[PDB]
Amino acid sequence: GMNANQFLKAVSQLQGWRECAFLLALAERSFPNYALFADAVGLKTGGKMRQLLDLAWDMLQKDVADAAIPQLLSKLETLCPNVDEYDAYGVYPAFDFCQLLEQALLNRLNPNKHRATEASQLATRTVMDFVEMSEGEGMDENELVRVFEHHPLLKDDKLFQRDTVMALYYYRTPKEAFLAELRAGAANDGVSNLGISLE
Amino acid sequence: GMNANQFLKAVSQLQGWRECAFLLALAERSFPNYALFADAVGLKTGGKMRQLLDLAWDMLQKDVADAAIPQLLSKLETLCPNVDEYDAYGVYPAFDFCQLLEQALLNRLNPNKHRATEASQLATRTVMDFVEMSEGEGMDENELVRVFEHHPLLKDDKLFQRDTVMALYYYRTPKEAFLAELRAGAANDGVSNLGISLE
Numbered sequence: 001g002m003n004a005n006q007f008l009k010a011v012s013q014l015q016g017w018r019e020c021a022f023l024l025a026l027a028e029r030s031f032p033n034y035a036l037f038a039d040a041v042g043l044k045t046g047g048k049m050r051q052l053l054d055l056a057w058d059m060l061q062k063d064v065a066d067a068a069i070p071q072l073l074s075k076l077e078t079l080c081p082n083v084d085e086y087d088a089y090g091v092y093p094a095f096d097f098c099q100l101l102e103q104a105l106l107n108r109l110n111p112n113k114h115r116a117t118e119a120s121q122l123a124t125r126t127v128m129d130f131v132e133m134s135e136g137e138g139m140d141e142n143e144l145v146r147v148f149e150h151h152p153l154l155k156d157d158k159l160f161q162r163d164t165v166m167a168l169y170y171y172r173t174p175k176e177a178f179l180a181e182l183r184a185g186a187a188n189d190g191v192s193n194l195g196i197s198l199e
Numbered sequence: 200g201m202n203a204n205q206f207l208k209a210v211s212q213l214q215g216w217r218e219c220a221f222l223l224a225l226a227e228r229s230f231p232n233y234a235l236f237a238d239a240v241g242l243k244t245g246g247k248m249r250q251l252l253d254l255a256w257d258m259l260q261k262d263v264a265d266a267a268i269p270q271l272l273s274k275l276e277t278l279c280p281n282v283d284e285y286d287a288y289g290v291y292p293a294f295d296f297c298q299l300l301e302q303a304l305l306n307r308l309n310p311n312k313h314r315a316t317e318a319s320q321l322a323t324r325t326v327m328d329f330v331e332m333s334e335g336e337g338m339d340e341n342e343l344v345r346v347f348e349h350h351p352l353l354k355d356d357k358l359f360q361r362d363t364v365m366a367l368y369y370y371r372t373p374k375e376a377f378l379a380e381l382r383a384g385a386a387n388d389g390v391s392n393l394g395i396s397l398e
């Protein structure tokens with residue numbers, strides 16, 4: 001079990017397929033930002049990107065030749081926009097999406113590098129930057145941060161990331177092993193919901 | 200997937216073993232309140248209660264004779280304190296724990312009655328009542344609610360309940376089916392983290 005201050009701690013412990021699943025989840029949640037941008041500026045790349053991301057998800061339960069991975073990253077780079085070459089805001093979330101998928105692909109080649117923490121921060125920043133651009137003009141810093149605290153996009157993003165990480169954290173096979181983890185989490189080392197224990 | 204306002208909605212859809220697991224999780228998190236009370240007032244019932252709760256958890260993956268269930272509830276009633284017969288506060292969380300376990304036991308006999316919503320509200324109220332008693336004396340209502348909003352026991356309880364419900368919500372066998380649900384949740388019906396879609 002992880003307390004209300006232990007999101008980043010579960011994230012920091014993700015490894016193997018669970019880390020990949022978390023990275024792909026962050027990218028999937030961002031994908032329509034890529035599709036919308038590609039459409040808006042008349043690129044015909046939305047469909048090709050959807051396939052590359054589909055393939056990244058399929059790779060979770062398939063062997064893939066290491067030798068094949070650099071070409072996948074190369075394809076991604078050709079679909080990835082340069083933020084300086086487009087004036088519309090939408091290019092920024094489009095680029096952020098590509099960075100998320102890049103991490104998931106790089107992780108297949110170099111799985112031992114930890115990525116989930118920084119990918120999670122990036123995924124949050126996409127939402128914060130968008131709220132700031134769309135609603136923050138003329139606000140003092142402290143007003144903006146009050147907008148952030150109650151903004152539904154940021155409340156939802158936070159709980160999406162946490163739900164995903166925690167679903168992965170508890171997941172086990174078979175069912176019995178899953179229930180043992182859920183139980184252990186509730187038991188909380190013998191410390192109740194009121195912060196007391198029979199120590 | 201469930202948004203930041205959809206905790207109670209996932210809870211309301213729990214059924215079968217998942218509902219039982221959620222009820223048992225709420226009781227397990229409360230159990231040390233029972234143990235502490237039983238100890239404090241010199242009852243020798245903590246160990247007997249621990250066994251009954253252990254049995255409730257074991258029942259999750261075992262057939263049990265319906266005919267045996269009323270006797271389990273009867274045993275629980277004999278371990279359950281009357282709040283009016285003890286002056287110390289600790290009796291109240293002790294009683295709340297018994298109510299949580301009672302729901303889990305009743306659910307085995309009558310599984311079709313929905314219980315998780317009200318059990319979740321009770322489990323929250325235990326923490327709110329305790330914060331109010333221990334810290335709220337002399338506070339205006341609106342001050343108290345500001346304490347509630349940032350109190351670590353209440354922040355943690357909220358995320359414990361949500362982590363548990365969501366772990367159950369996503370769980371499937373085999374691994375592939377679990378990953379399909381996690382993916383679907385991230386895809387969010389084609390609506391990105393910025394609230395946009397290619398509709």
Ligand code: NA
Pocket residue numbers: 019107110111112113114115
């Ligand atoms: Na890694």
Ligand code: NA
Pocket residue numbers: 218306309310311312313314
């Ligand atoms: Na039920």
